[PDB]
Amino acid sequence: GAPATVTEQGEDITSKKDRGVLKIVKRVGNGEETPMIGDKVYVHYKGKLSNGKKFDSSHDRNEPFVFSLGKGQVIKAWDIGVATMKKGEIAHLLIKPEYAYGSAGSLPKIPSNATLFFEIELLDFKGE
Ligand SMILES: COc1cc2cc(OC)c1OCCCOC[C@@H](C)OC(=O)[C@@H]1CCCCN1C(=O)[C@H]2C1CCCCC1
């Protein structure tokens, strides 16, 4: 499935090159602006534990997920990965614990040392 494909074929978009955040572009977006730190960002996403064992969707809330990039609202891997996307792009991210919830986890949703998978569509972004 998608998580294994990203392991095998994803690009390492970390500064450290530690394969902490692996990305595949699944649908190409438009323009060549990508969101800058501070931007108000609008996405739809489907996410789960690597393990397949918990699953989560923006669609569950019936509404886009909105956050300021690099403002510690989301895990480090989102600040990193969404910043590489173009408006209208869909990407797959596979994320090691260090770029997500770490060895502490976030119970009961997220266990210790959890690898996470997301599909993200970038809908839009606007300057602060
Ligand atoms: C750890 O708590 C949650 C994690 C997720 C969804 C949650 O609710 C819909 C959630 O609890 C409510 C807090 C809202 O704040 C989410 C923020 C921390 O989340 C994140 O940084 C990331 C990226 C933005 C989308 C939500 N992300 C999650 O980690 C989800 C996970 C995804 C894997 C399956 C379990 C939920």
Three-state secondary structure call for residue 70: coil
**What is the Å distance from ligand 1's center to 109 Cα?**
8
Which residues make Cβ contacts (< 8 Å) with residue 15, sequence separation at least 6?
Answer: none
DSSP per-residue letters across 11-32 = EE--SS-SSSEEEEEEE--SSS
The catalytic residue among 75, 80, 95, 110 is 75
**Are 127 and 93 contacting, i.e. CB atoms less than 8 angstroms apart?**
no
Determine how many CB atoms are found less than 10 A away from the CB of residue 51: 12
* C-beta of 74 in contact with ligand 1 (< 6 A): yes
**Are 59 and 46 contacting, i.e. CB atoms less than 8 angstroms apart?**
yes
Q: Annotated catalytic, 75?
A: yes
Nearest 5°: the CA angle 1, 115, 121 is 65
Experimental resolution (Å): 2.0
What distance in Å separates the CA atoms of residue 123 and residue 57, rounded to the nearest whole number? 15
Q: Where are the domains of the chain?
A: 1-128
Q: How far apart are the first and last CA of the chain?
A: 37
Task: Count each helix (H run) and each strand (E run) in the chain, helices first.
Answer: 2, 7
Method: X-ray
- Sort strands 90-95 and 11-12 into parallel, antiparallel or unpaired: unpaired
Consecutive H or E run containing 48 = strand 40-49
